[PDB]
Amino acid sequence: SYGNGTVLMPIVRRVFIGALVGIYAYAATDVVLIPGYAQL
C-alpha cells in the first residue's frame, strides 16, 4: 500500500507459497506416483 514501509514480507509470502507448491509436487511424485506406477 502507498505510505507504508513493509516491503520484504510480501516477497517472503510469494516465496513461501511457491516453495510449498514445489514441495507438494515433488512429494506426490516421490511418495505416491512412482510406486503407484509399479503397482499399475
Binding site: 500500500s1 502507498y2 505510505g3 507504508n4 514501509g5 516491503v7
Partner: protein
C-alpha cells in the same frame, strides 16, 4: 531495442483488455464452474438437512451467547490496527463513538471478573451492522489513493530522516532505524 519491444507486448495486451470494456453494469460471472454447481445442487437435500444446516445454526448460537455474556456487539470485534476501519472510526459521529467506547470498557471489566450478566441484560440483538455506511466510504477513499499514487514502485533516499527510504512515513517503526538518539531527552513525532 529490448525495452521498447517488451513495451510493445505490454501495450498490445492492454489494448485488448481496453477494447472489451463495458459501458454499464453487467452481472459478475459465477464463482464456481457448472460441474460443481451441478454436484452441489444434486447433493443439497441430504447435505443441508444433516450437516450444513446444524453447523450454521450452532455457529450463530455460540456467537450470540458469547457476545451477550459480555454485552458487546458484533462490530465491536474489529480493531483499529486495520487501516480501513481506522478511517471508518475517524468518520464516526459523537454518540456512536461514545457508546462503542463504553461497551469496550464494560467488556474488558467483565472478562476480567468472569461473571455472567443477568439474563435481563442480555435481551438485545448483537448482529446489527452499525459500522457499514462508514466502512464503505473508507474503502472508496483508500482505493482512490492506490489508484492515483500507488501505481508504481517509487525510488527514495535510503536511511534518512528516520525512515528506511523504501516507503515508510513514520519514523523508527523498523529495527534498522531504532534508537534515534544517543544523548539528550529524545522527543516524539507528534510534537514536531
Amino acid at each position: 531495442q529490448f525495452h521498447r519491444e517488451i513495451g510493445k507486448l505490454f501495450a498490445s495486451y492492454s489494448n485488448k483488455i481496453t477494447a472489451n470494456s463495458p459501458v454499464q453494469y453487467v452481472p459478475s460471472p459465477p464463482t464456481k464452474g457448472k460441474v460443481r454447481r451441478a454436484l452441489s445442487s444434486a447433493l443439497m437435500p441430504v447435505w443441508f438437512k444433516f450437516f450444513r444446516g446444524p453447523l450454521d445454526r450452532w455457529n450463530l448460537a455460540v456467537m450470540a451467547k458469547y457476545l451477550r455474556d459480555h454485552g458487546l456487539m458484533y462490530d465491536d470485534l474489529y480493531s483499529d490496527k486495520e487501516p480501513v476501519f481506522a478511517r471508518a472510526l475517524e468518520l464516526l459521529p459523537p454518540d456512536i463513538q461514545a457508546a462503542r467506547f463504553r461497551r469496550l470498557m464494560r467488556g474488558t471489566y467483565l472478562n476480567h471478573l468472569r461473571l455472567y450478566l443477568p439474563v435481563h441484560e442480555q435481551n438485545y440483538d448483537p448482529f446489527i451492522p452499525y459500522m457499514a455506511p462508514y466502512v464503505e466510504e473508507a474503502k472508496f477513499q483508500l482505493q482512490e489513493e492506490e489508484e492515483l499514487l500507488g501505481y508504481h514502485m517509487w525510488e527514495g533516499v535510503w536511511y534518512s530522516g528516520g525512515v528506511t527510504g523504501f516507503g515508510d512515513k513514520e519514523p523508527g517503526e523498523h529495527f534498522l532505524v531504532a534508537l534515534p538518539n544517543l544523548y539528550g531527552a529524545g522527543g516524539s513525532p507528534m510534537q514536531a
